[PDB]
Amino acid sequence: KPTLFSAYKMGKFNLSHRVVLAPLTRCRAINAIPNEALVEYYRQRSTAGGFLITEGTMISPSSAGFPHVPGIFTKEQVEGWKKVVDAAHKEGAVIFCQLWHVGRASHQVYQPGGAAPISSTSKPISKKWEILLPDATYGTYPEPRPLAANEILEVVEDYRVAAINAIEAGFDGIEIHGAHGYLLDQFMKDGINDRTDEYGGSLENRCKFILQVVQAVSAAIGTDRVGIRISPAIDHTDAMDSDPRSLGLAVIERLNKLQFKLGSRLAYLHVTQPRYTADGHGQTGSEEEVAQLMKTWRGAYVGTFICCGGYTRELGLQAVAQGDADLVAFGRYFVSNPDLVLRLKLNAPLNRYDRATFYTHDPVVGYTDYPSLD
Ligand SMILES: Cc1cc2nc3c(=O)[nH]c(=O)nc-3n(C[C@H](O)[C@H](O)[C@H](O)COP(=O)(O)O)c2cc1C
Ligand SMILES: O=Cc1ccc(O)cc1
């Protein structure tokens, strides 16, 4: 019977337990090159048959919206990732690279030639939100430039190339970052997408871009090496949809149809959910609604389902035991608990995490120096 600590066949891959390292931007990849700090970071968190998803990784120079995040669009970057991947594999881990384009959630200082960030729209993120700049101050999100149709196809090509480069680096697969108000979410969410062309309006039009990406990377490296992450009900950086339930089901129906058409299943669907507790962990109304949404989306998707967002040991156990999810990803707890899988198995205390060093750049401090049990 399925439990949080029981084995799982994720299509092509075999896992020994259901605890997953959620993708986490940490900003230690100085000048976008994966390095020895990242090697130790992922090695520390690796387990035999444990699934790891990397931090968001740039698919292009226009992809960036944080400092010192890794890319996978140059040979030098690929060579850096090889070292990370080899170390993870030496521990028996399965590791996917998350492909990340931030869209309008960026700033001129992050853009080639100081160009405007690109998006579905010309509308900027509101002043209620601010962006961390490379000089450790916070700045204003600028007006983005809306992509023309041919430019969207160029971004699809960037994802395709990024996927091929990931496989060259030895990654087991990739995850399409389609969540949290970044580029693809800027097209899906009717709170952001005000386009009047073939990429705006209907759910069909709004889902077109992300489906083109899924189709392209599946063609390049195989459906069974492709995972997709979405967050229809998370509002981060003004990324709301008027009907998250329908948006989620629209994406899922299209994934199901693509799988049926091509004759194989994607590696997984990965959905993050909002929480309504003070600290954003665990459970307290909106809670019950969100919980049912997640069960509805799980039930509608044909294949492996990863849940994420505020899961605890008890909630992770329940999720797998009751069939609500096949795999459970952990973000913040994995920051401060390199041996999180062991700690969960032993019901050991979890180290507190320090948010002040989430996005600083030191290879050791607040990055690789959280203690393991051993
Ligand atoms: C510091 C930090 C960095 C994150 N970076 C990413 C990222 O690069 N890509 C992504 O999809 N989610 C990212 N997330 C969201 C997490 O994957 C996760 O969904 C979120 O933290 C909620 O899960 P949790 O309660 O286990 O932390 C990040 C979260 C935090 C706190
Ligand atoms: O979902 C992507 C993401 C990236 C950086 C963050 O800090 C949080 C989320």
Side-chain angles (χ1 to χ4, degrees), residues 6-21 49-53 93-97 171-175 222-228 259 265-270 298 301 303-307 326-329:
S6 69
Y8 186 75
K9 185 179 182 290
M10 192 173 69
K12 190 177 199 298
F13 312 99
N14 288 280
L15 306 173
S16 300
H17 59 75
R18 320 295 186 91
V19 181
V20 180
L21 167 65
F51 184 39
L52 310 170
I53 306 165
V94 173
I95 181 168
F96 274 31
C97 177
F171 278 106
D172 297 294
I174 62 96
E175 180 179 277
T223 58
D224 55 354
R225 296 188 182 284
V226 175
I228 171 172
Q259 292 181 158
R265 309 238 184 107
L266 303 162
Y268 59 80
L269 173 63
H270 185 174
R298 176 53 179 111
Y301 174 61
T304 296
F305 187 94
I306 314 189
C307 59
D326 304 297
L327 299 164
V328 183

Side-chain angles (χ1 to χ4, degrees), residues 23-25 66 98 100 177 179-180 182 229 359:
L24 295 151
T25 292
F66 273 79
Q98 189 192 62
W100 188 27
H177 193 338
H180 308 155
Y182 293 115
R229 193 182 222 207
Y359 312 115

